[PDB]
Design a binder for this molecule. Structure first.
Ligand code: NAG
Ligand code: CA
Ligand code: CA
Ligand code: CU1
Length: 278
């Protein structure tokens, strides 16, 4: 395994957002042309094993551990009736104190806040991606498509991401092979070599959240200078067209930076390769 490996994301200009927004309240529109300098993106969501290396090295206690609770989706035992604050839920105990990560070391780390993610990425010699970098990377070299791979959810009759199948929230059929998370290296890569960029775990980005965007062309944009919530991208194993259609590269949501949940993780980015881990 090389679950901290990065891929080179080429310099380019791309269309961020969409003039055909599917969730208008989220500021998916307007489409705008954005120029991105070449950089590096983690191929994988940060896994439990990789996060454990960080905690072993630094002693870091995550925010959910210090607060003593985190949000867990009821279907695997608040923003919605299916989100419950569970005492003792955290990255090591993703459904609460009687759950474990021992059987899922290669799954994405969960219950990590924005601050926890920044701490990990900086320890790794990296950083969070901006929203524009994240979306450009998600799109995988394709223009104005719904998904990293194109416009069909199941191209060639194949599942390409870990989302929900069945009637949410009562029945997840696990048709795609995974009820909860999947290993970080599951499913096909996109055109840039990224795995699970849509689905699996949601992913923090560095930007403050706003829904007000201009059509002006921009260069390496960082988002607004202030805010109260940080932007997350890409959707999760819970998403379904019927209620939360956020497994599209253009989709976007937000949470306060001290937030954490059982469907929210991250990956890192870097301007240049960090020191080789000998
Ligand atoms: C973290 O440290 C513990 C205790 O030394 C060890 O058992 C475990 O394998 C370490 N985890 C990683 C990912 O190195
Ligand atoms: Ca699934
Ligand atoms: Ca993901
Ligand atoms: Cu969703």
């Amino acid at each position: 395994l090389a679950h901290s490996k990065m891929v080179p994301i080429p310099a380019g200009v791309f269309t961020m957002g969409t003039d055909d927004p599917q969730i208008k309240q989220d500021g998916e529109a307007p489409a705008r042309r954005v120029t991105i300098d070449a950089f590096y993106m983690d191929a994988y969501e940060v896994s439990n094993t990789e996060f454990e290396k960080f905690v072993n090295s630094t002693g870091y206690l995550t925010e959910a551990e210090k607060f003593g609770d985190s949000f867990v989706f009821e279907g695997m035992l608040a923003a919605a009736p299916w989100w419950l604050p569970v005492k003792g839920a955290n990255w090591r105990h993703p459904e609460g104190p009687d759950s474990t990560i021992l059987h899922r070391p290669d799954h994405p780390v969960l219950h990590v806040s924005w601050n926890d993610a920044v701490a990990y990425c900086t320890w790794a010699g990296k950083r969070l991606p901006t929203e524009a970098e994240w979306e450009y990377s998600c799109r995988g070299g394709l223009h104005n498509r719904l998904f990293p791979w194109g416009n069909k959810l199941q191209p060639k009759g194949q599942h390409y991401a870990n989302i929900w199948q069945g009637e949410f929230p009562v029945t997840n059929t696990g048709e795609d092979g995974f009820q909860g998370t999947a290993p970080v290296d599951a499913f096909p890569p996109n055109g840039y070599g990224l795995y699970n960029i849509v689905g699996n775990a949601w992913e923090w980005t560095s930007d403050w959240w706003t829904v007000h965007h201009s059509v002006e062309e921009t260069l390496n944009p960082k988002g607004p200078p202030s805010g109260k919530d940080r932007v997350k991208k890409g959707g999760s194993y819970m998403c379904h067209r019927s209620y939360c259609y956020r497994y599209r590269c253009a989709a976007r949501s937000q949470n306060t930076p001290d937030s954490s949940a059982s469907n929210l993780g991250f990956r890192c980015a870097a301007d240049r390769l960090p020191t080789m881990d000998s």
